[PDB]
Amino acid sequence: TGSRRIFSGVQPTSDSLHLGNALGAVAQWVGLQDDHDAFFCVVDLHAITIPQDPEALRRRTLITAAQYLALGIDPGRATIFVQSQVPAHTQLAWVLGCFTGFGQASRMTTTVGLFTYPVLQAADVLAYDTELVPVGEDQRQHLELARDVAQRFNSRFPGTLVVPDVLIPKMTAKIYDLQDPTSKMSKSAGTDAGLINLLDDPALSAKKIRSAVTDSERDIRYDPDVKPGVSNLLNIQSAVTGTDIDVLVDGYAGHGYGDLKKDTAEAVVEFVNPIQARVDELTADPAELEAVLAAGAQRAHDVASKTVQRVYDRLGFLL
Amino acid sequence: TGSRRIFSGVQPTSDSLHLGNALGAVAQWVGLQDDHDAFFCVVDLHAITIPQDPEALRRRTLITAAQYLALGIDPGRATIFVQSQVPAHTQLAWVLGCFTGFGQASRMTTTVGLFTYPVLQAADVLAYDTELVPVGEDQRQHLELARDVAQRFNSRFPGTLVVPDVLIPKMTAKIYDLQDPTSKMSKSAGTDAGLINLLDDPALSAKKIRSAVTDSERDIRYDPDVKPGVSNLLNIQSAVTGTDIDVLVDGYAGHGYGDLKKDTAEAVVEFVNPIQARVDELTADPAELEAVLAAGAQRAHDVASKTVQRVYDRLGFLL
Numbered sequence A, B: 001t002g003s004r005r006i007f008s009g010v011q012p013t014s015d016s017l018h019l020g021n022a023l024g025a026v027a028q029w030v031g032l033q034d035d036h037d038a039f040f041c042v043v044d045l046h047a048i049t050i051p052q053d054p055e056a057l058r059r060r061t062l063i064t065a066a067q068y069l070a071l072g073i074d075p076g077r078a079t080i081f082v083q084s085q086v087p088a089h090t091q092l093a094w095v096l097g098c099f100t101g102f103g104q105a106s107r108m109t110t111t112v113g114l115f116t117y118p119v120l121q122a123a124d125v126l127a128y129d130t131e132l133v134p135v136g137e138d139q140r141q142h143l144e145l146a147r148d149v150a151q152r153f154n155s156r157f158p159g160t161l162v163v164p165d166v167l168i169p170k171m172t173a174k175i176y177d178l179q180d181p182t183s184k185m186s187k188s189a190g191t192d193a194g195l196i197n198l199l200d201d202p203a204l205s206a207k208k209i210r211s212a213v214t215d216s217e218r219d220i221r222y223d224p225d226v227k228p229g230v231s232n233l234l235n236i237q238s239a240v241t242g243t244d245i246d247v248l249v250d251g252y253a254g255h256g257y258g259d260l261k262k263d264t265a266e267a268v269v270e271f272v273n274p275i276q277a278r279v280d281e282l283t284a285d286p287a288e289l290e291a292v293l294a295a296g297a298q299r300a301h302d303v304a305s306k307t308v309q310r311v312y313d314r315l316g317f318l319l
């Protein structure tokens, strides 16, 4: 319809989403898109906060969209679009920066774009009257700024911006690195060794799961605190399977960590193959992906430009 | 035609331009628009770096445009338009901030918008392939950043942005306050007492010219250094008249400062009346001013959107 409005975005900063993106974010999107009016964005403007190769950035914009479909985003149920194609984001970003404290952006955990991108992220969400933002844990402080500036703006102009609720999971809120269970799996960690990429060679990812840092307790128990690597593997295995962790952990009574890494690599391999097949097709036959993105952008402009003119009108701009 | 491209903008932050704006900037625009393809912008996005009353901001956007015409901007020779109506400015601003050092913007002589507006100013100019920027002295450091980021961007993507030349006058590069000849006449000085507003009551402005702080030398000599107030009055009188300062200063041999303030107030009054009459008509009959601004914005979008897609293409964005 047009309510329970959802918005979330991933950066085209690499040739593959990793498990963090797919289980911590896109999995939530897939569950939600059924009864939520959803907008899913490849946020290429954010990518260039860091220097980007032009050939790769265009390639990765499509590859990221396609991974959205290969994870189950349904272009009949949701809108996929590329951020740079909707001018409203930057328009709203300028306005919102005028309502963002300098210290407020300083305290976010060097270029101007590196300093202001949380404001652009704020405009990304608020531009679509978003009710709910499915993100992982690391995007939380960002979206608390987005809500503060929305309330800051609404106090001067009541009823203009929707204040969004932050919808972040529990299990999957942070998929940690496999060699470094203290850090989150992310695209700039130096080693893809702890990095499980959706589109990597499934036997390569399986070999990283086998080399996952565990403890010595010889006990398969879910405690993210003291058993980081081990709780990660179960977190991962539970997410790619649909099986609750407790039902796994009890099934792992008597088992050691070898059986744990085997089953998790078993399941990740069976997870990523249907994805890689879908992604391959979409890259070799781009007609579909570009039709989706083209309809996506027109629908996004239809919504986001109306928000911008409402904000502009409230500010006193001549329309 | 479409070459010797000129761009410059004033903020709709008050109900009247003062002499600084009109002699330090708009006078140059009027001379230049004859053989320069000129774009003159009411920069309302910049206004809201400081909180603005919505009714006043819309009123002042039109009043500022109209003062452009009442000073001799010819809508058949130049484009007048409102910044917020051309999305390209913010688009290009986001890109350019990604190429602007944080320290680089720090060193510009608190909100995020207050911190980034020189980047938005940079996009304002570079969005139109601008060859020359007629500004007063205070806008210089700003436009040196605009050129640095343009060269910074062109080194990665050669031939994309025009690097603009900064065109700043001498006499009129800084019209100083009348009570405080050490400061520049500006709209946020606390007293309009030293402020000569184009649209103020001409006898009120004349009374401020009579109360202008001079020295004691009893000699009418142009030296901005030691004779601030006195050189200002001659600077002012020379600009509103067309008479060189030396031809005035020699004409003022034997004269005292009373004759100087009288003649300067004589000339300012005869300057501002034709303006106030034109401005009144344009406010009472807005049809004309809005036709100008509407054609202005379409021509500005035609140019500035082509620049944005060229920049976007060079970055690797999917178009």
Ligand SMILES: Nc1ncnc2c1ncn2[C@@H]1O[C@H](COP(=O)(O)OP(=O)(O)OP(=O)(O)O)[C@@H](O)[C@H]1O
Binding pocket: A008, A009, A010, A011, A012, A013, A019, A020, A021, A023, A024, A025, A134, A135, A136, A137, A138, A139, A172, A173, A174, A175, A176, A184, A185, A186, A187, A188
């Ligand atoms: N390790 C992770 N676990 C769970 N979710 C994650 C993880 N990393 C990123 N996300 C989620 O991915 C979404 C988009 O993040 P982003 O595109 O920045 O991915 P990233 O791995 O942080 O990439 P980069 O390192 O280039 O910033 C957000 O919802 C964020 O919470």
Ligand SMILES: Nc1ncnc2c1ncn2[C@@H]1O[C@H](COP(=O)(O)OP(=O)(O)OP(=O)(O)O)[C@@H](O)[C@H]1O
Binding pocket: B008, B009, B010, B011, B012, B013, B019, B020, B021, B023, B024, B025, B134, B135, B136, B137, B138, B139, B172, B173, B174, B175, B176, B184, B185, B186, B187, B188
């Ligand atoms: N005192 C002055 N003398 C000469 N030029 C000036 C003066 N003040 C501003 N200008 C010129 O006016 C143009 C636009 O400036 P702006 O709209 O900021 O006016 P301002 O007086 O500085 O207003 P504010 O105080 O609201 O910033 C620039 O080209 C700038 O150089």
Ligand SMILES: CNC1=NC(=O)[C@H]([C@H](C)c2c[nH]c3cccc(F)c23)O1
Binding pocket: A007, A008, A009, A010, A011, A043, A046, A047, A049, A117, A120, A121, A124, A125, A133, A135, A139
């Ligand atoms: C460097 N730019 C950057 N890093 C981040 O982590 C965010 C993130 C990718 C994001 C942008 N827009 C969004 C809208 C909704 C949800 C989001 F997670 C986002 O942007």
Ligand SMILES: CNC1=NC(=O)[C@H]([C@H](C)c2c[nH]c3cccc(F)c23)O1
Binding pocket: B007, B008, B009, B010, B011, B043, B046, B047, B049, B117, B120, B121, B124, B125, B133, B135, B139
């Ligand atoms: C708070 N914003 C702000 N203060 C300034 O002094 C500049 C100035 C008004 C400006 C904006 N865009 C321009 C393009 C060309 C020439 C210009 F003088 C400008 O902007």
Ligand SMILES: [Mg+2]
Binding pocket: none
């Ligand atoms: Mg990130």
Ligand SMILES: [Mg+2]
Binding pocket: none
């Ligand atoms: Mg100023």
